Amino acid sequence: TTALVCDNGSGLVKAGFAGDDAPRAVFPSIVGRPRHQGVMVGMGQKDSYVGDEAQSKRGILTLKYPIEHGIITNWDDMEKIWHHTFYNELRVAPEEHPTLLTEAPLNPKANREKMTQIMFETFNVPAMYVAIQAVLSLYASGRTTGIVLDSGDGVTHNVPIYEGYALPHAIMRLDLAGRDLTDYLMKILTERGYSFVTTAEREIVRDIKEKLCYVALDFENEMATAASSSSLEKSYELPDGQVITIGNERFRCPETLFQPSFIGMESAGIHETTYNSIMKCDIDIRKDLYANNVLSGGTTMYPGIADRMQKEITALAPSTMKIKIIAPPERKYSVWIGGSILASLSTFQQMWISKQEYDEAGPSIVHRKCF
Amino acid sequence: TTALVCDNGSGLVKAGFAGDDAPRAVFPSIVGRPRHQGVMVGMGQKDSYVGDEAQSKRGILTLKYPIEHGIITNWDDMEKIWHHTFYNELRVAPEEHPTLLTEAPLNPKANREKMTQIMFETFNVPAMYVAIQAVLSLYASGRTTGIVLDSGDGVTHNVPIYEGYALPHAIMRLDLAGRDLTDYLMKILTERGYSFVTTAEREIVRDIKEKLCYVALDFENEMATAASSSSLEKSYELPDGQVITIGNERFRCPETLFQPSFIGMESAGIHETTYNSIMKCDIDIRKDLYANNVLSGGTTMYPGIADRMQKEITALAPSTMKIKIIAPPERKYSVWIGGSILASLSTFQQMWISKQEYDEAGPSIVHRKCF
Amino acid sequence: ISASRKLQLKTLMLQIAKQEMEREAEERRGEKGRVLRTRCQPLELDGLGFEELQDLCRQLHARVDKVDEERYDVEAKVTKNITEIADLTQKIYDLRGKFKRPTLRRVRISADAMMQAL
Amino acid sequence: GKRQTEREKKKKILAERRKVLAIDHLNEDQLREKAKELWQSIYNLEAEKFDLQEKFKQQKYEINVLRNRINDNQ
Amino acid sequence: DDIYKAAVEQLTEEQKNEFKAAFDIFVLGAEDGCISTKELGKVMRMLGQNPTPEELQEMIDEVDEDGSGTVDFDEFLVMMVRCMKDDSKGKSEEELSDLFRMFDKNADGYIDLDELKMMLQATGETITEDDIEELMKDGDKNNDGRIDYDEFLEFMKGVE
Ligand SMILES: Nc1ncnc2c1ncn2[C@@H]1O[C@H](COP(=O)(O)OP(=O)(O)O)[C@@H](O)[C@H]1O
């Protein structure tokens, strides 16, 4: 039979059968209970709208993501999300399909063990396998080397790989991602008068960020230009009218990636954690990693980031090496495409964690040889 | 049929069919298992890369030479190296070809007996013969007398020969060679800030030594000059950029040959062990040995050694004798060229150790008349 | 340098190549026929005692066993060369798969067309 | 690899392929028929082996071109 | 070559529906008398899914190479083949390997330039600017005069 390549993510759940080009169903991972009282009788009001249904009734819900930073903080809601994904968005019972979840690097063990225990006890799948979210993104590019920066919505991690041999001592995981950029944008919009507070209006700020923000090639020059002319002010129409005008908030929101001091984080930007991740590698594979830097994940879709990052790394790196940044147009679904490719391989067909194996060793089987 | 003139050496395996000018395949003798974990599936990752393949993937391997000082310390790896040499670099099955290995003087017997046992049992050659590495280097020069200093990469030995009669009581074998010079260079580079530690970076230090180091004609004058001017500082580009500048480390690394007290060895330099080897000979053949001093081996390729050695010996020797140092341009492959010449001789064709002879007397046949 | 001229030239040369490939195939077929015909060693089957008939057929049995043994040896050797070819195929496919390995997949079924139903 | 085992397999096949027939187990004419049957089987075997040699020559072709490309990579 | 096989395989269940539906949609007549002899453009425009331009150009040129300017049922099927993916799709890579084996039957480790010369002599195509140029550039893809296997391998690959 065919395998189910699910990809929990944090912000958008992407799923679909193995062997295709794009995920079959992509929908936000939010579960929102209603918060008001409700007076109409017999309206058929449910107790929790999940997935894309709660992005249409979000006016009277309190949306809450079940995955904070890679890790899962609310297991009941995550179980509900998985149940919805299997039964309503794909309509395939899990009793007859292997599953291939994905997990960020350096995550707590208990999260992974609980994930496999749920998949084997509640949904009762035949066999499931958990894979690191960066190796798949490297599969999708058709490479076999390279250092991949997978800046998702929950957590940004940077896994270097050479000739198929991952370097476990050079993984640099940073917890700044799309959600913190949304919060920072929502916080700097208040400097013009627009106040978004409700958890429903966070979605509106996210839409503003997606449609308007861009990464500046040079920050100081853009700050000077936006403060003199008015060629940058782009307007946007809220879900009820009252258009708003975003000035130099456009390139200040995604600039937080390269200067995490804006949101008070100490660490260095995504332009310098990649160079540090390279320098921890051996001295003889640094040229190949320099030449095959891969971008993935949703948050790396800002217009103009593949040039800013290349300029920064070229500034840091030695002058002789060639710096090349691979930015495929299908960046958002790169991890899932790689997952489909991996699940479609014949050599991989014996790596699944078969159910009888789980029955013999318990949920701690995932840390064992079947990784 | 044709004979296989293999030459194990220590650092570079040189092989080729008898009767040519240069070895057919020359490649480092290193076997390196991978050391990291490896995450890509189906990449076709082998368990041990040998020969010149492991000089390209050395970034994720742990290279380890199977021959320490002439002697062989790891028989499985040496067998792997031989198998590679026969099947992939020459592509001739050993079942149909005699072999002519080479061995340093004064080596342990068990090494030679195990070598012949392997060649007769595993590879199953028709007949093999083991020859001393210095007599061949004397063949290649077209002489029949002379005292040859064969400073390889493992061990430096100095065999005097007159009129074809070797003098077994005058062989002076010293264990300082190219590898110790590489280690000493790697140890003195730390005085400028460059630290090479990994077994892969030993190859980089070896390349630095080959391309930059030279032997000073007079040591104190060079030490004084390099400490005042800056006309010696030559720069070199690492495999990733960050050029380095070598100052008076240039002629201090190969100076260890003439003053083995630098690396803590007690013995006298290669300039004085040759004179001692001569003085042990009879009083009537010392003039001929003085006039026909032969250099061979890789490590004698330093620019300016054929003059320093001549100056030193002229200082030691009596003033009347003429001191001449034969330094052919084909020094590195001198032993193998001599091996080809010896294997191509008709008079030598009945000295091979035929397999039936080995079956009758066991591996201890090599010490017998068939030397 | 014209594209039309280039395509005409490559088309004609490709067809000549295909014709010569069929020519080589039928040439090998004829060579095989000749080799099989010349393999047979005819025997004078008539006017011999039946025990001699059994003897001769047993001798041919020994010949057959030896010949099939030679075939086994050459098949094993070509099989080892097959393993070597597989290794070298792994080498080239790895060197190129570093960029074009995941091309093996199934795409363009229903998401690319069925979209207005939702 | 480990020619003793390979030769062992060869001898197992040959002893298996040593279809020695007994005395009163055919007709003289049937004996001729079986002899010719072996003849034709071995002729087909020779055709297969000849094509095998052709394909092995092509294998050598691929080997030399492959190693030449390998050297070109350096 | 594969052209006639693709033409015969046009008789199927999907492309039959495609031809029928297209005929019922935008093949009727009742024009001003201009005679849409070049209605292949109409079909390509009305397809709604343009294939790779190679099929379209082969239909444009290869069809009516005599300049008939008329399309019949068989040519309708030819156009329908040009619509869907009925191509041989580069023939068989085994064909490429066997062809290069016949080329370097001399065991040069590559298709020698003289192999190309003899093949051109057999094909007899006039030596134009493209002639010899293709041979040399393929042989000198490294631009060093050295002809390697993969050079002509990719030179002949991608074509039927
Ligand atoms: N076109 C876009 N431009 C800018 N940001 C985007 C765009 N699309 C998505 N994002 C950001 O990326 C996030 C989605 O990232 P995604 O890759 O789905 O995370 P995950 O790894 O959990 O799947 C969204 O929250 C959004 O903030």
Ligand SMILES: Nc1ncnc2c1ncn2[C@@H]1O[C@H](COP(=O)(O)OP(=O)(O)O)[C@@H](O)[C@H]1O
């Ligand atoms: N051009 C060169 N200049 C200086 N040193 C060299 C040069 N070439 C080789 N060497 C040294 O000689 C060694 C090779 O010696 P070689 O003669 O191959 O040893 P063996 O006797 O084991 O074959 C290398 O390790 C290197 O350190």
Ligand SMILES: [Mg+2]
């Ligand atoms: Mg992700």
Ligand SMILES: [Mg+2]
């Ligand atoms: Mg030597």
